[PDB]
């Protein structure tokens, strides 16, 4: 019994009458490339990606970001081509290239990337970290404008918060310095959330900082809706992710409902969700910047828990499920003597009635 295939055969298109005329792969790299390109295509049979690959909703990922700016591709390409023309005409550059000793300015390339391709890479990195999934319950945003946050340690040292890096709570104890390009007439809002810092409700998250109505780049003059609170990731609970979000207000916004008393050391009051918050504010609020970083536990968390939060610090532990053993049989055939030690619970000797 044979059943016709439900789709085209993988090698049905290739003829075989003139297979000698057909050009061969003749190399492993070409076959590998064709193989991966084929594997990246949908199929009507069961495949690895069907069972292990993640599934996405058919609806397109909804965007809430700032509309893309326009630019003249022809002029951009002309300037780029003349720049590379003069660069290749420069003999010293060509000699360095042939000697394989040329070097590129890392700071310059990063600064140019932050304006050219930075937003898309940052969006992809945030999607990989899953922020868009947990908060917003599924949405997308492109960080059109850049933001730079630094925590001041010592008198000179700065710990930056670029994207998903590791910063200790000892460094994050004080309020950081925030910089972002802006001009007069723009109202900004800064928010900080701990995605995994919650201790009671897994779905909810803890708000740690909220500034509203920042005039331009004058961050200090902004209204302090909620005082800054350093992160408190519990020891043994893993690595948490703390997210800074910069939003823009087309109209002035009153923040009376979400206002928090100063100080706000209660976890129930610090409980917050960006979901339904961006829902109630989306009419007159729109994101412009996003950043985040990873955080572990350190000694400063103990002080924060004992004094700032006035509570006993909880300590967690990662524990694996107990090993599986089959149901014990009365006569274990051909099993080693240690078969009974697997089902014995205590290693101390027992004597029963005696």
């Amino acid at each position: 019994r044979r059943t016709p295939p439900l789709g085209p055969m993988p090698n049905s298109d290739i003829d075989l009458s003139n297979l000698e005329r057909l050009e061969k792969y003749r190399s492993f790299d070409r076959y590998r490339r064709r193989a991966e390109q084929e594997a990246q295509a949908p199929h009507w049979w069961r495949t690895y990606r069907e069972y292990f690959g993640e599934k996405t909703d058919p609806k397109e990922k909804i965007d809430i970001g700032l509309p893309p700016p326009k630019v003249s591709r022809t002029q951009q390409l002309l300037e780029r081509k003349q720049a590379i023309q003069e660069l290749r005409a420069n003999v010293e550059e060509e000699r360095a290239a042939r000697l394989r000793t040329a070097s590129v300015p890392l700071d310059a390339v990063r600064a140019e990337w932050e304006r050219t391709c930075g937003p898309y890479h940052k969006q992809r990195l945030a999607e990989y970290y899953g922020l868009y999934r947990d908060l917003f319950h599924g949405a997308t945003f492109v960080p059109r404008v850049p933001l730079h946050v630094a925590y001041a340690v010592g008198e000179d040292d700065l710990m930056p918060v670029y994207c998903g890096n590791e910063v200790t709570p000892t460094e994050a104890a004080q309020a950081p310095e925030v910089t972002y390009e802006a001009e007069e007439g723009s109202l900004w809002t800064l928010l900080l959330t701990s995605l995994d810092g919650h201790l009671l409700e897994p779905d909810a998250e803890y708000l740690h900082w909220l500034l509203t109505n920042i005039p331009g780049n004058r961050v200090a003059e902004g209204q302090v809706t909620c005082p800054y609170l350093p992160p408190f990731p519990a020891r043994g609970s893993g690595i948490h992710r703390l997210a800074f979000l910069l939003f823009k207000q087309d109209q002035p916004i009153d923040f009376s409902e979400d206002a928090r008393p100063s100080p706000c050391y209660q976890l129930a009051q610090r409980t917050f969700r960006t979901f339904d918050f961006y829902k109630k504010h989306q009419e007159t609020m729109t994101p412009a910047g996003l950043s985040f970083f990873q955080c572990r536990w350190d000694d400063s968390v103990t002080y924060i828990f004992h004094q700032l939060l006035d509570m006993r610090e909880p300590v967690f532990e990662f524990v694996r499920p107990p090993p599986y053993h089959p149901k014990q049989k009365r006569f274990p055939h051909r099993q080693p003597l240690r078969y009974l030690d697997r089902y014995r619970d205590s290693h101390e000797p027992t004597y029963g009635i005696y």
């Binding site: 792969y25 492993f28 193989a35 084929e38 967690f316 532990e317 694996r320 499920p321 599986y324």
Partner: protein, 106 residues
């Protein structure tokens, strides 16, 4: 002579069967099936599960290792656009690695 008995070699766990770590999935004289995710192969081409989960069978693209000169030579002689396919057996883990629970309140 030649009075040998059968070797009882074949599939031991079908599609959708729940397996534990170390269980033999299939034994074979030659590589009829290929291991996939969390499936190990022994010296005698015996397939066992490295993780506890559900067994699945799929058709997957065959890309041999470069050091396998015989298979490299075999695949380098195919007409352009040809792709080899083979049956792979996978196990989908069911339980998480572990959980975090409160152990002390200091």
């Amino acid at each position: 002579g030649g009075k040998s008995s059968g070797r009882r070699q074949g599939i031991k766990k079908m599609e959708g069967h729940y397996v534990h770590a170390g269980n033999i999935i299939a034994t074979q004289r030659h590589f009829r099936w290929h291991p996939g995710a969390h499936v190990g192969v022994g010296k005698n081409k015996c397939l066992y599960a490295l993780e506890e989960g559900i067994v699945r069978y799929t058709k997957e693209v065959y890309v041999p290792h470069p050091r396998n000169t015989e298979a490299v030579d075999l695949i380098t002689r195919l007409p352009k656009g040809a792709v080899l396919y083979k049956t792979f057996v996978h196990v989908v883990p069911a339980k998480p690695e572990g959980t975090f629970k409160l152990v002390a309140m200091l």
